[PDB]
Amino acid sequence: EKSVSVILLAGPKQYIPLLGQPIALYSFFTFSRMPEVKEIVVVCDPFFRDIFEEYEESIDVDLSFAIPGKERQDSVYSGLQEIDVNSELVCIHDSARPLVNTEDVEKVLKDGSAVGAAVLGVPAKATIKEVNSDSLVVKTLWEMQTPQVIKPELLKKGFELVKSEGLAVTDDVSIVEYLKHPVYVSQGSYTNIKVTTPDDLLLAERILS
Amino acid sequence: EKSVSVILLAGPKQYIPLLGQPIALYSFFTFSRMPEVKEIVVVCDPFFRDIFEEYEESIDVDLSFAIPGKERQDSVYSGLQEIDVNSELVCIHDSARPLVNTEDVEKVLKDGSAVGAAVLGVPAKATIKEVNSDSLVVKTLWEMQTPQVIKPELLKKGFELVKSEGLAVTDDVSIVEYLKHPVYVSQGSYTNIKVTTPDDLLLAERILS
Ligand SMILES: N#Cc1cnn2c(O)c(Cc3ccccc3)c(Cl)nc12
Ligand SMILES: N#Cc1cnn2c(O)c(Cc3ccccc3)c(Cl)nc12
Ligand SMILES: [K+]
Numbered sequence: 001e002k003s004v005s006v007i008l009l010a011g012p013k014q015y016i017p018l019l020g021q022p023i024a025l026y027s028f029f030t031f032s033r034m035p036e037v038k039e040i041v042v043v044c045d046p047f048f049r050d051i052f053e054e055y056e057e058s059i060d061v062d063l064s065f066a067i068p069g070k071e072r073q074d075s076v077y078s079g080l081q082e083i084d085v086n087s088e089l090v091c092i093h094d095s096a097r098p099l100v101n102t103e104d105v106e107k108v109l110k111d112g113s114a115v116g117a118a119v120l121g122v123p124a125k126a127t128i129k130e131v132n133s134d135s136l137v138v139k140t141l142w143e144m145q146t147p148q149v150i151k152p153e154l155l156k157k158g159f160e161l162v163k164s165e166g167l168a169v170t171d172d173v174s175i176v177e178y179l180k181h182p183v184y185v186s187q188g189s190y191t192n193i194k195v196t197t198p199d200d201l202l203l204a205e206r207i208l209s
Numbered sequence: 210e211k212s213v214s215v216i217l218l219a220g221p222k223q224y225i226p227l228l229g230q231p232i233a234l235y236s237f238f239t240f241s242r243m244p245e246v247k248e249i250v251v252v253c254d255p256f257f258r259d260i261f262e263e264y265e266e267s268i269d270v271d272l273s274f275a276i277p278g279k280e281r282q283d284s285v286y287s288g289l290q291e292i293d294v295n296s297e298l299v300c301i302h303d304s305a306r307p308l309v310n311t312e313d314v315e316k317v318l319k320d321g322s323a324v325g326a327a328v329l330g331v332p333a334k335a336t337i338k339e340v341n342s343d344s345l346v347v348k349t350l351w352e353m354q355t356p357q358v359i360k361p362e363l364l365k366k367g368f369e370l371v372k373s374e375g376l377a378v379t380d381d382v383s384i385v386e387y388l389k390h391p392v393y394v395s396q397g398s399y400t401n402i403k404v405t406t407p408d409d410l411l412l413a414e415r416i417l418s
């Protein structure tokens with residue numbers, strides 16, 4: 001209980017309402033009601049702080065804020081600077097995923113605690129293949145979602161390594177890929193979609209019923 | 210000209226209308242108007258033959274039919290048995306992809322002719338990772354679409370090898386993966402979606418405007 005700090009990424013499609021509520025507030029509330037969660041560090045343009053700020057006394061978590069940066073990793077880093085000095089786990093979530101299930105958050109938190117780093121994923125349904133520089137097929141794949149859950153010292157070491165040795169950040173689990181620590185893939189739900197265009201918004205409404 | 214035989218897979222979501230026309234007819238017509246295409250072998254439950262049969266004298270291709278089988282590869286094989294004895298290329302298409310562009314069909318036909326086997330693909334947008342049996346991340350991916358275009362002798366040899374040596378067919382390019390022949394990935398369009406649920410159907414309508 002109160003061992004997890006959520007970094008909620010909300011640096012605009014994550015504020016378009018879903019049944020009257022901005023998309024970013026759904027996951028915000030899902031996390032707030034979990035007794036595991038001590039605090040939520042919201043990463044957002046200060047223009048939208050109000051959207052979250054209205055609910056501070058009514059939620060049972062500490063609310064903090066962080067300034068976004070140029071790339072997703074910069075926004076992750078900024079949020080990381082604000083967590084309780086004794087948080088055992090950081091839980092990084094894309095606010096564009098409003099429909100994440102509490103049960104799946106529970107699973108990835110559990111796996112993150114056990115393993116050190118964990119991320120929600122689902123089996124990739126489509127035929128997906130590695131392709132080389134000459135456009136030829138190179139002769140189980142999982143699609144990643146969020147939360148991404150990691151022990152703060154682990155993530156700090158990852159940022160430290162990328163920084164000092166000047167490494168290339170390419171995708172959403174690139175930083176830990178440079179470390180030798182294992183990353184567990186917690187099996188999630190296909191309903192935990194990223195809601196970035198009006199067609200997704202419609203999906204979200206059907207899932208919400 | 211008249212060098213390509215299309216195997217149109219329509220073995221029910223591919224007959225739900227899109228702006229009044231069953232989904233399966235969109236690609237059917239796209240292929241019919243191409244002077245490269247000699248014939249279309251439609252693979253469908255005979256219950257729906259009429260849907261295609263109505264247009265035979267008005268299209269400029271020979272129309273043939275084949276019975277589906279249990280798995281997609283069986284349906285591919287059945288269609289293969291019906292093509293002109295002198296077709297230089299077979300063009301396999303999932304009728305659930307109604308929005309394929311003529312220009313992209315032209316590209317994959319060109320690449321299939323040059324290389325021997327080619328398939329439309331797009332860069333996979335999501336973070337996708339290989340995961341091992343212990344649920345851990347294994348430390349460019351492309352999403353495949355159709356058409357899949359192949360020289361008929363190449364595809365026949367592939368079915369022959371899988372059959373005689375009893376190999377496991379897993380995904381949509383599995384059969385050729387056993388051969389040493391290269392498979393080219395022709396860059397397609399994100400609009401060439403597979404339309405399997407009412408939300409896709411809505412996507413299709415927006416793309417169609
Ligand atoms: N942006 C961004 C980004 C790039 N890499 N990377 C990363 O490795 C983690 C850490 C992490 C990875 C997997 C599972 C949990 C945590 C997080 Cl949270 N973000 C990023
Ligand atoms: N079902 C099914 C199926 C499984 N494998 N496989 C395959 O290799 C090809 C041939 C092909 C592959 C890549 C590019 C063109 C053709 C086709 Cl057409 N279908 C299948
Ligand atoms: K380590």
Ligand SMILES: [K+]
Nearest residue numbers: 194196197200
């Ligand atoms: K999407």
Ligand SMILES: [K+]
Nearest residue numbers: 366388389390
């Ligand atoms: K060969």
Ligand SMILES: [K+]
Nearest residue numbers: 403405406409
């Ligand atoms: K779909």
